[PDB]
Design a protein around this ligand. Structure first.
Ligand SMILES: CC(C)CCC[C@@H](C)[C@H]1CC[C@H]2[C@@H]3CC=C4C[C@@H](O)CC[C@]4(C)[C@H]3CC[C@]12C
Ligand SMILES: CC(C)CCC[C@@H](C)[C@H]1CC[C@H]2[C@@H]3CC=C4C[C@@H](O)CC[C@]4(C)[C@H]3CC[C@]12C
Ligand SMILES: OC[C@H]1O[C@H](O[C@H]2[C@H](O)[C@@H](O)[C@H](O)O[C@@H]2CO)[C@H](O)[C@@H](O)[C@@H]1O
Ligand SMILES: NCCc1ccc(Cl)c(Cl)c1
Ligand SMILES: [Cl-]
Ligand code: NA
Ligand code: NA
Lengths: 219, 534, 214
């Protein structure tokens, strides 16, 4: 039915400029007012800007006002937000949210696109296997882990055996420490499964062009 | 930038209720029901009200509030080519004020004539009477009732006039009453909507007080149900008729009164984010509800006459001034405590007109104030000049042939002439300015766009249901006559000029500003089809 | 701007109990202009309640809104594990449009002790010059848990990266990853490393250790 797809977004030097787009489909785009709602890494929802059905009525939050420019293409059904002199506090996930009626709120939201504003250089993750200690005496189930350390910016795609086993898998969110993210993932399996079957940690960090599969061995 | 707003929101509503609710809610609507088949007439009425009348009522109010300007300036900033509409609209409102205010004067005259133990229009033995005077209404035109002769041969002295060519002497009792009317109108519109919005608290509400009192007194009288029966009895045979839908339409349009630039002017003082959709609905209803209520008020008393007073119903069921200045007072005189019923009735009529006249005038003043800065600060001095013009020229209505002048303006000042203005109001908004652009404007204000229902009404239904009723009124056109008097061929042409002088502003100012702006070819139209911001 | 504050910030409830969260505005908000959104973990927000009492499409009857002026509330008559999410209110009355601080509704369950797993630095990292010891504390309730790192029986504090998963959808538990980071030097300078987790479930901390000789 109604689909909103945010595109663009990524790493931008502070003071830099970037333009976000939203692909609207499944409704008459010219008939509805559109807004940008961004969500900070602190998960705080902040309304950025609103554009009317014809693009003739524009509102801005005092935070982004004069820096951000929201525009509209009703012909191609695309919503735009043009950013300039970007600041580190502008780092958030930008949502494309539709609603025409103020009294109905925003009835449709997009998948969102991520803006990261930082001076921090893009660096590839170092992926390490986490192998259990020697002569562990146990047992019924064995826990394995994967350490993705020292990367920027997010995201990383961490699956197991190319995503074959999703069960008993805890992939911990990244944590930023001095301009570097460190992610880890644990997966628990029965000791009959390992190491009699291959358990490989599949890590994808598209930003640095890193696709790395790391198998875990009890060496 | 900043213009004054309503001191309170109720001031606006009462101004609009007041303007909308008028003498036709009394002397026209209930007659139409009785004539067109009663509660069956409500169907074309309701339809025309629903599809034609309220959307255009809603449209005007929205436009006023949004563009924050008077009638002229609003259409200039909306569709610069069609700015002529704002002139047509105001000039129409200018003509109606000549015509409409004398009705209030009549009401005040009857009011001042109502201080007495015995009302002068009861019997036939007075000096102004004719040997042919009968106590109550009848069939043969040669024999008038006592109230008819009082109104015509004393108040009007219309007998002394042979037509619109002979106005005769000026009635100085009527000129006095007309002056008192324009005095009240002045000090209401004096300082603007500061006082105006407060004044309409009386003029708009007071008739509802009197309506209730007469509703009870009316329904407490013998044969009252018979009148209500004549009023509401559902004969659906008239729906098939063409002129009934024409009557249902023109009434709905005249009763709500879009296209006078009153709704535009009154709304231009609203706060931008105010919800005008609930205001238009609330006002539309109350106006039509008042007409429905007054229907019982008139016909409960009209039935009382056909029972106790031995008169035929078709004689006492009347429209126009004839009903309130002759037929209804004739009944009041018979019932106990008559002097009281008379005093409140005529005061009701006056207070029904005033707020309606306030709007017409305000429509002109606001429109002119927003156009010329040499008006707005000078407003105290301007409305003095305007009403002085109204009074001096209005003295013609106070002559012995005054009614013949009145009746002429009654037909031609506004008329189907307002319909082509409103028709051009609908076409300009829905097509040139566009509905998608207009819905977007209302969304910014009230928070939500109009339903597809309103849009289709503005774009398709209302122009259709306007255009074809204004056409079916032209084919059903006949030369102007009052009673046995037939207006001369030249009097008709004068009225057409009055009806024309407004409407022609729409093509004239179009052509004028079409030649005025720099450019050529197509895009000359872009300059005049691009709104104020674009 | 009109700031909307929501309380509680975090709320835990067992399935079936009633929950009520509140939304307070600094300025009065028209009852027609106040709305509620539900955002599940890792998902977009969804319109939930609009115009203060009105449920959106797909929203079960168990949800109800109420209130007016500066005080509004969302109430779930009988909560399901399906309903664990973060709820944001919002006001459209005026600009700038503002969202409430949000209420995180998490599912309450029976206490579970964490399964602690300590992982020595990989040989791949050791040759890079760094060494980091990873500790995994998985599937426990409630969320509060405290890790303490000991190298050779003395507590080490600095240089630790802690990470917590969002409340799990299946068993409604939480998990934690604590990473103590050193270089190849400080690591090889010692032998015994201890990851201890102090949690509600036990008087004694759950201990997992390893030695570089083994
Ligand atoms: C007072 C009595 C006698 C007559 C009153 C009739 C009036 C108030 C009623 C009758 C039919 C009604 C209309 C029916 C259809 C609609 C469509 C809706 O989307 C907007 C309101 C609107 C336009 C209604 C407005 C009010 C209405 C016009
Ligand atoms: C005469 C009998 C049958 C009916 C009487 C109608 C009266 C009671 C109705 C008709 C018009 C109404 C008013 C018009 C609208 C408003 C504005 C609103 O903000 C306050 C109420 C107020 C002021 C209404 C009060 C009640 C009212 C005066
Ligand atoms: O209503 C009849 C009573 O008033 C009349 O007086 C007239 C007066 O003639 C006129 O000049 C003035 O302007 O209006 C009043 C009110 O109608 C009669 O003259 C009285 O005898 C009657 O009592
Ligand atoms: N009855 C509303 C229409 C109307 C009535 C009186 C006047 Cl003066 C005007 Cl302009 C318009
Ligand atoms: Cl009416
Ligand atoms: Na009316
Ligand atoms: Na009036």
């Amino acid at each position: 039915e109604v689909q909103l797809v945010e595109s663009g977004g990524g790493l931008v030097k502070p003071g830099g400029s970037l333009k976000l787009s939203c692909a609207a489909s499944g409704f008459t785009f010219s008939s509805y007012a559109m807004s940008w709602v961004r969500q900070s890494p602190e998960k705080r929802l902040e309304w950025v800007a609103e554009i009317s059905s014809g693009g003739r009525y524009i509102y801005y939050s005092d935070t982004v006002t004069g820096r951000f420019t929201i525009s509209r293409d009703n012909a191609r059904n695309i919503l735009h937000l043009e950013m300039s002199s970007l600041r580190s506090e502008d780092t958030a996930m930008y949502y494309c949210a539709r609603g025409e009626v103020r009294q109905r709120g925003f009835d449709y939201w997009g998948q969102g696109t991520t803006l990261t504003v930082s001076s921090a250089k893009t660096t590839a993750p170092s992926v390490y296997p986490l192998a259990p200690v020697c002569g562990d005496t146990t047992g019924s189930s064995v826990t394995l882990g994967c350490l993705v350390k020292g990367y920027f910016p997010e995201p990383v795609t961490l699956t197991w055996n190319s995503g074959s086993l999703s069960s008993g898998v805890h992939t911990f969110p990244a944590v930023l420490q001095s301009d570097l993210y460190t992610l880890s993932s644990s997966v628990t399996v029965t000791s009959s499964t390992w190491p009699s079957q291959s358990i490989t940690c599949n890590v994808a960090h598209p930003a640095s062009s890193t696709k790395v599969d790391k198998k875990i061995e009890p060496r | 930038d900043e213009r004054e707003t309503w001191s309170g929101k109720v001031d606006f509503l009462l101004s609009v209720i007041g303007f909308a609710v008028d003498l036709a809610n009394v002397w026209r609507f209930p007659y139409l029901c009785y004539k067109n088949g009663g509660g069956a007439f409500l169907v074309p009425y309701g339809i025309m009200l629903a599809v034609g009348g309220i959307p255009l009522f809603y449209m005007e109010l929205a436009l006023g509030q949004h563009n924050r300007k008077g009638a002229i300036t609003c259409w200039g900033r909306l569709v610069p080519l069609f700015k002529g509409i704002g002139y047509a609209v105001v000039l129409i409102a200018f003509y109606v004020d000549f015509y409409y205010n004398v009705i209030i004067a009549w009401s005040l005259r009857f009011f001042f004539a109502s201080f007495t133990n015995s009302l002068p229009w009861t019997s036939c033995n007075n000096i102004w009477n004719t040997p042919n005077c009968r106590p109550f209404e009848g069939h043969v035109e040669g024999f008038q009732s006592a109230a008819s002769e009082y109104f015509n041969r004393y108040i009007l002295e219309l007998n002394r006039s042979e037509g619109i060519h002979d106005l005769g002497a000026i009635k100085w009792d009527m000129a006095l009453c007309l002056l008192i009317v324009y005095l009240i109108c002045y000090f209401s519109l004096w300082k603007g909507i500061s006082t105006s919005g407060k004044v309409v608290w009386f003029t708009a509400l007071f008739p509802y007080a009197v309506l209730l009192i007469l509703l009870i007194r009316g329904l407490t009288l013998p044969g009252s149900f018979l009148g209500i029966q004549y009023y509401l009895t559902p004969n659906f045979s008239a729906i098939y008729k063409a002129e009934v839908w024409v009557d249902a339409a023109t009434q709905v349009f005249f009763s709500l009164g879009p296209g006078f630039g009153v709704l535009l002017a009154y709304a231009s003082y609203n706060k931008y984010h105010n919800n005008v959709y609930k205001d238009a609905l609330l006002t539309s209803f109350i106006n039509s509800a008042t007409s429905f209520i007054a229907g019982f008020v008139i016909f409960s008393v009209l039935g009382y006459m056909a029972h106790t007073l031995g008169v035929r119903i078709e004689d006492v069921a009347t429209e126009g001034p004839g009903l309130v200045f002759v037929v209804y007072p004739a009944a009041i005189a018979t019932m106990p405590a008559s002097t009281f019923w008379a005093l409140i009735f005529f005061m009701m009529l006056a207070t029904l007109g005033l707020d309606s006249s306030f709007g017409g005038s305000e429509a002109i003043i606001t429109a002119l104030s927003d156009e010329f800065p040499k008006i707005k600060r000078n407003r105290e001095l301007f409305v003095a000049g305007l009403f002085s013009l109204y009074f001096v020229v209005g003295l013609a209505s106070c002559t012995q042939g005054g009614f013949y002048f009145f009746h002429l303006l009654d037909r031609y000042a506004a008329g189907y002439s307002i319909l082509v203005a409103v028709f051009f109001e609908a076409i300009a908004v829905s097509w040139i300015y566009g509905t998608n652009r207009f819905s977007e404007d209302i969304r910014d204000m009230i928070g939500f766009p109009p339903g597809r229902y309103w849009q289709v009404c503005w774009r398709f239904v209302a122009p259709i249901f306007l255009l074809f009723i204004t056409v079916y009124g032209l084919i059903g056109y006949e030369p102007l006559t009052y009673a046995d008097y037939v207006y001369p061929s030249w009097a008709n042409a004068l009225g057409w000029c009055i009806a024309g002088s407004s409407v022609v502003m729409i093509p004239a100012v179009a052509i004028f500003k079409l030649l005025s702006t720099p450019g050529s070819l197509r895009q000359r139209f872009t300059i005049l089809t691009t709104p104020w911001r674009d | 701007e009109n700031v909307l504050t929501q309380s509680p910030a975090i709320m835990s409830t067992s399935p079936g109990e009633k929950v009520t969260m509140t939304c307070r505005a600094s300025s009065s908000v028209g009852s027609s202009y106040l709305h509620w959104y539900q955002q599940k973990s890792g998902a977009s927000p969804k319109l939930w309640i609009y115009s203060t009492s009105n449920l959106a499409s797909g929203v079960p009857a168990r949800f109800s809104g109420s209130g007016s002026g500066t005080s509004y509330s969302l109430t779930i008559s009988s909560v399901e594990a399906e309903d664990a999410a973060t709820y944001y209110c919002q006001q459209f009355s005026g600009y700038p449009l503002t969202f409430g601080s949000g209420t995180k509704l998490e599912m309450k369950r029976a206490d579970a002790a964490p399964t602690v797993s300590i992982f020595p630095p990989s040989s791949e990292q050791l040759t890079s010059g760094g060494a980091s010891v990873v500790c995994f504390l998985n599937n426990f309730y409630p969320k509060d848990i405290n890790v303490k790192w000991k190298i050779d029986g003395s507590e080490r504090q600095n240089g630790v990266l802690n990470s917590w998963t969002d409340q799990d959808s299946k068993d409604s538990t939480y998990s934690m990853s604590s990473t103590l980071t050193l270089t190849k030097d400080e690591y090889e300078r010692h032998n015994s490393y201890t990851c201890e987790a102090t949690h509600k479930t036990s008087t004694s901390p759950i201990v997992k250790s390893f030695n570089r000789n083994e």
